């Protein structure tokens, strides 16, 4: 088992903390601060408990190992963190090197420091692209030196970067300090998912939605071994329906590879006892546009040639709601329509309504990061579900039954 922050003594200690501050940005400003807010409990605990410093490190975006200060700087995050903490945050223009080590060597007590984007250095990922666009690999001596440098910035290490936990990057697995502790966010996220996977309240419903089938196959198979019911929604559903029901789907997404295995998936579900709920009706569009002409369809009518399905219809929302009603635990990963466009948002919104009502009556409702978490912000329901994950990719890994290097790298207890 793993060391965690609650058991760590930080008094008079410099804490180097990996966080996931890889927040959505637009035009040099933050569009969603949840990832930042999510780390505050760990940071506050360190400060409250006497830490000399807290040195925060993260990536932002995918600069691919070249400094891109004008495009992918973490400077705005520092400003936002200050607002959230109500305490000053010193932003450094790099993450390693002699000046950074000196700045972090013995700061004034209580100092909060945010380093520049780790991914400005190829050593963080271990690979990248040069300024010319060439793929490159980092060199071993250089990668060790990068890790050594980060390790100097603190006396103890905390990893609260749940969002990044799937990445075996230098900041994430390569810090060499005597104590390497999981932070409060890391703990909370893992604990929600482990329980869902291992010991769920039942019935356990998974709601999976998305465009493709092919890239959810490990997810669906693993989940089919854990759940009692599954809703398969969004664009991916058309593959199941074309295969299963001989449905005419028009220009709707169709996954040729996935089509090959739909029956195998259904057969597994039937063997395991899992009830599969697919959509039975749709909102149609003449093209993939917010302002497309719209229509309605059912599995039986088909979708007319040249049209595409972009949301489920009211009959599907009904059927989805029945499954939600039965559930004692829910994991929801994926919207069931093109939620960012009004004409195609009704299915997702209705489903959100149901999940919120479920929570109120004791359902454990866990919302996967990414698009599903985005819907929670959009519709202001972040506090009306049990858990809104900060980590869409990381949580998909957990849902697929895979290990997280970021976790595994922590100190054993």
371 known member of a binding site: yes
147 as an active site residue: the answer is: no
Q: Note every long-range contact of 352-361, with CB atoms under 8 Å and residues 24 or more positions apart, other chains counting.
A: 352/376, 352/379, 352/381, 354/320, 354/321, 354/324, 354/325, 355/324, 355/330, 355/381, 355/385, 356/381, 356/384, 356/385, 358/324, 358/325, 358/327, 358/330, 359/384, 359/385, 359/386, 360/384
Active site residue 35: yes
Measured CA to CA in angstroms, residue 99 lies from 14, 145, 195 at distances of 17, 15, 44
Separation between Cα atoms, residue 173 and residue 320, nearest integer Å: 41
Cβ(55)–Cβ(113) below 8 Å: yes
Measuring CA to CA, which residue among 81, 144, 145 is closest to residue 115?
Answer: 81
Q: Is 58 annotated as a binding residue?
A: yes
To the question of whether residue 358 is assigned a binding role by annotation, the answer is no
CA distance 32 to 378: 10
Give residue limits of the domains in the chain: 1-185, 192-400
**105 contacts: CB under 8 Å, gap ≥ 6:** 152
Instruction: Quote the CA–CA distance of 173 and 154 in Å, as a whole number.
Output: 15
Closest CA to 16 of 121, 130, 95, 124: 95
- Which of 13, 18, 35, 52 does the annotation list as catalytic? 35
Burial label, 33 (beta-carbon count in 10 A; 0-12, 13-18, 19+): middle
- Nearest 5 degrees, angle CA 368-CA 15-CA 86? 70
Choosing from 2, 44, 212, 268, the catalytic residue is: 212
Nearest-5° Cα angle at 300, 294 to 301: 40
- Asked if CATH classification 3.40.50.1260 holds for the domain at 192-400, the reply, yes or no, is yes
CA-CA distances (angstroms) from residue 139 to 37, 128, 301, 304, 374? 35, 11, 59, 56, 38
326 is catalytic: no
Structure tokens belonging to residue 199: 């010991």
Residues 6+ apart with CB under 8 A from 293: 285, 286, 287
- The Cα-based distances of 45 to 84, 158, 185 in angstroms read 14, 12, 12
How would you label 89-109 residue by residue, b for 16+ Cβ within 10 Å and e otherwise?
Answer: bbbbebbbeeebeebbeebee
Write phi, then psi, for 292 (nearest 5 degrees): -65, 155
Q: Six-digit token pair at 245? A: 């029901």
Instruction: Specify the experimental method.
Output: X-ray
* 151 CB-near residues (< 8 Å, 6+ apart): 16, 157, 174, 175, 176, 177
Please state, in angstroms and rounded to a whole number, the distance separating the CA atoms of residues 283 and 285: 7
Ramachandran sector of residue 298 (left: φ over 0; alpha: ψ -120 to 50; beta: rest): beta
Is 1-185 a CATH 3.40.640.10 domain? Answer: no
Active site residue 174: no
In Å, what resolution does this model reach? 1.7
Question: How would you list the strands of the sheet with 229-233, edge to edge?
Answer: 275-277, 229-233, 204-209, 329-333, 364-367, 387-388
Distance, C-alpha 271 to centroid of its chain: 31
Assess whether the region 1-185 and the region 192-400 belong to the same CATH fold: yes
18 is in an annotated binding site: no
Establish whether 309 is an annotated binding residue.
Answer: yes
């Amino acid at each position: 088992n793993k060391l965690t922050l609650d058991k760590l003594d930080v008094k008079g200690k410099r804490v180097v903390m990996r966080v996931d501050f890889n927040v959505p940005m637009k035009n040099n400003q933050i569009t969603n601060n949840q990832r930042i807010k999510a780390a505050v409990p760990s940071i506050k605990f360190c400060l409250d408990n006497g830490a000399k410093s807290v040195v925060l490190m993260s990536h932002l975006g995918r600069p691919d190992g070249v400094p891109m200060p004008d495009k992918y700087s973490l400077e705005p995050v520092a400003v936002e963190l200050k607002s959230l903490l109500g305490k000053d945050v010193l932003f450094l223009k790099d993450c390693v090197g002699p000046e950074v080590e000196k700045a972090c060597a013995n700061p004034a007590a209580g100092s909060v420091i945010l380093l520049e984007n780790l991914r400005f250095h190829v050593e963080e990922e271990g690979k990248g692209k040069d300024a010319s666009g060439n793929k490159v690999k980092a060199e071993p001596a250089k990668i060790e030196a990068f890790r050594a440098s980060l390790s100097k910035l603190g006396d103890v290490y905390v990893n609260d970067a749940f969002g990044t936990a799937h990445r075996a990057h230098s900041s994430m697995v390569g810090v060499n300090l005597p104590q390497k502790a999981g932070g409060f966010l890391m703990k909370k996220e893992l604990n929600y998912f482990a329980k869902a996977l291992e010991s769920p309240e039942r019935p356990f419903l998974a709601i999976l939605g998305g465009a493709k089938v092919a890239d959810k196959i490990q997810l669906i198979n693993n989940m089919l071994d854990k759940v009692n019911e599954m809703i398969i929604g969004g664009g991916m559903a058309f593959t199941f329906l074309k295969v299963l029901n001989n449905m005419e789907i028009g220009t709707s997404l169709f996954d040729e590879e996935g089509a090959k295995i739909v029956k195998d998936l259904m057969s597994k579900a039937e063997k395991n006892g899992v009830k599969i709920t697919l959509p039975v009706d749709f909102v149609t569009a003449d093209k993939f546009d917010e302002n497309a002409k719209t229509g309605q369809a059912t599995v039986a009518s088909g979708i007319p040639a040249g049209w595409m399905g972009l949301d489920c219809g009211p009959e599907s929302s009904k059927k989805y709601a029945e499954a939600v009603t039965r559930a004692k635990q829910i994991v929801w990963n994926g919207p069931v329509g093109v939620f960012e466009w009004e004409a195609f948002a009704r299915g997702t919104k209705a489903l959100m309504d149901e999940v919120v009502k479920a929570t109120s009556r004791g359902c454990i409702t866990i919302i996967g990061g990414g698009d599903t978490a985005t819907c929670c912000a959009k519709w202001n329901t972040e506090d009306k579900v049990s858990h809104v994950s900060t980590g869409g990719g990381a949580s998909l890994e957990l849902l697929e039954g895979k290990v997280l290097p970021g976790v595994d790298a922590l100190s054993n207890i």
